[PDB]
C-alpha cells in the first residue's frame, strides 16, 4: 500500500524494499503525501530559512571527459574561459556586498589553478567573514589538505551514480572507487562534505536510485545535490532521454526523509527542466538555493547542460531574484552561514 510505505517512512523503517516501492509507485495521492512528509520534516528539522550559496563558475576548462557533461574535454564547440584570481576575489566581494553568507567556487577540473591559486583565492575570500565552499572535482589529498588549511569550509563532490559499472562508463577517466575515496578524504579532513547523484542517466535503474539513497544515508553527508540528467548536444549522450522531474523530486524528498538535518539544494537543473522547478523542490524537502553569480561574459559559456536558466540575465540579478523567491514561498533568508546543525537522534 502507499499508505503502508508512508507509515514505514514515518517510523524510519528505511529498508531497500520500502525505498524501491516509494520510487516505483506512480500514484498521485501517494506522491503528494510523500512530498508533504518531506516538506514537514524539512520544516521541523531545518526550519524555514533558505540558505543562499552564491556560486561563481570561474573556469570552464576541464581535463576530464565525462560523457554527460558539456564541459568534457572533447567538446571542441565550446569557447573556454578562465577568470583571473583578482576577478574571482572581487566577484566574491560583490556577492558578500549583496548579502551572500557562503561563496561557492565551482569549475571544470582546470589544472591552471591547482593547488596554490585556489589557496590564495580562498584566503582572500575568508577575510570577508563568510563560508567558502569548493566544487573543483577530484584532486590529490594534498590539494584538499592545502585548501582546508587555506580556510575552505565545505566541498561539493556529487557521487553522480553509486553503480560502479555505470560510473566507470560515464566517467572514463576515473571510477566510483576514486570518487568515494575523495569523499572519504574530504570528510576526514573536516570539510562539510556534499555528495548527490543525477537521476535519469542512460542505463540507470530504479534499483540504482535506491542504491544512491542508501549510499547517501550510509555516509551521512552534510549536503546532497540531486538533479535530473539533461542531455547536451555536444556530447555522446546528446540523443538520450532527459531525467524525469517527478522521479527526481521524489529522490529529493526521500533524501530529506533519510537525512533530516542535511542541507539539500533546489538545483539549477531542476529549474531548467521545469519552469518553477526550484520553487517546487524547495517545497518538497530542499532548504538551499544557489543563485548564479558568474559574471558576464562567462555565464553563457558554463554549459554543463543546455537551456540553463539565468544565463541571459544581468549578472547581479540572481541574488535579489532568490530573495524574492524565498519571500513569495513564505520562507526566510538564512541568518548565519547555514552550516549543518546536527540533530542527534535514535
Ligand atoms: C497550488 C496547487 C493547487 C491548489 C488548489 O488550487 N486547490 C483548489 C483551491 C484550494 N483553496 C484552499 C484555495 C480553496 C478551496 O478550499 C475552496 S474552492 O476550491 O475555491 O471551492 C496545489 C495542488 C497540490 C499541491 C502540492 C502537493 O500537495 C504536493 C506538495 C506538498 C508540499 O507540502 C508542498 C508542495 C507541493 C508540491 C504542493 C504545492 C501546492 O499546494 C499544490 C501544487
Ligand atoms: C483548481 C484549479 C481550477 C480547476 C477548475 O477550473 N475548476 C486547477 C486549474 C489548473 C490546475 C493545476 C494544473 O492542472 C497543473 C497541475 C496538474 C497536476 O495534475 C495537479 C496539480 C496542478 C498544479 C493543478 C492543480 C489544480 O487542479 C489547478 C490549479
Ligand atoms: C552593495 C550596495 C552598496 C552598499 C554596500 O556595499 N553594502 C554592503 C552591505 C553588506 N551587507 C549585505 C553584509 C549588509 C548595496 C546598496 C543597496 C543594497 C541592496 C538593497 O539593500 C536591497 C536588497 C536588500 C537585501 O537584503 C540584499 C539584496 C539587496 C538588493 C541589496 C544588495 C546590496 O547590498 C546593495 C545593492
Ligand atoms: C505543468 C508542468 C508541465 C508543464 C508539470 C511538470 C511537473 C509537474 C509537477 C510534478 O509532477 C510534481 C508535483 C506532483 C503533484 O501531483 C502535483 C504538483 C506537482 C508540483 C506537479 C505540477 C505540474 O503538473 C508540473 C509542474
Ligand atoms: C530589492 C528587491 C526588489 C526586493 C525583492 C524581494 C525583497 C526581499 C524580501 O522582501 C524579503 C526580505 C524582506 C530583506 C528581504 C530579503 C527583501 C530585500 C529586498 O527588498 C528584495 C530583494
Ligand atoms: N548533462 C548534465 N545534466 C545534469 N547535471 C549535470 C550534467 N553535466 C554535469 N552535471 C552536474 O554538474 C555537477 C558539477 S560539474 C563541476 C564541478 C566538478 N568538475 C565535478 O565534476 O564535480 C556534476 O557533479 C554533475 O552532477
Ligand atoms: S562533470 Fe566536472 S569533471 Fe566531468 S567533464 Fe564536467 S566539469 Fe569536467
Ligand atoms: S534566480 Fe536567476 S534570474 Fe531568478
Ligand atoms: Cl554550501
Ligand atoms: Cl548541488
Ligand atoms: Cl544542477
From Swiss-Prot:
Q: What is this protein called?
A: [FeFe] hydrogenase maturase subunit HydE
Source organism: Thermotoga maritima (strain ATCC 43589 / DSM 3109 / JCM 10099 / NBRC 100826 / MSB8)
Q: What class of enzyme is it?
A: oxidoreductase
- Annotated Radical SAM core domain ranges read 48-267
**Which residues are involved in binding [2Fe-2S] cluster?**
310, 318, 321
Instruction: List the keywords (alphabetical).
Output: 2Fe-2S, 4Fe-4S, Iron, Iron-sulfur, Metal-binding, Oxidoreductase, S-adenosyl-L-methionine
The residue stretches assigned to a coiled coil in this entry are none
Q: What is the effect of changing residue 66 to A?
A: Eliminates binding of one iron-sulfur cluster
Q: What does this protein do?
A: Required for the maturation of the [FeFe]-hydrogenase HydA. Catalyzes the reductive cleavage of S-adenosyl-L-methionine (in vitro), suggesting it may contribute to the biosynthesis of an essential sulfur-containing ligand that binds to the hydrogenase active site [2Fe-2S] cluster.
The annotation note on the cofactor reads: Binds 1 [4Fe-4S] cluster. The cluster is coordinated with 3 cysteines and an exchangeable S-adenosyl-L-methionine. Binds 1 [2Fe-2S] cluster.
* Swiss-Prot/TrEMBL cofactor(s): [4Fe-4S] cluster; [2Fe-2S] cluster
Assembly and interactions?
Answer: Monomer.
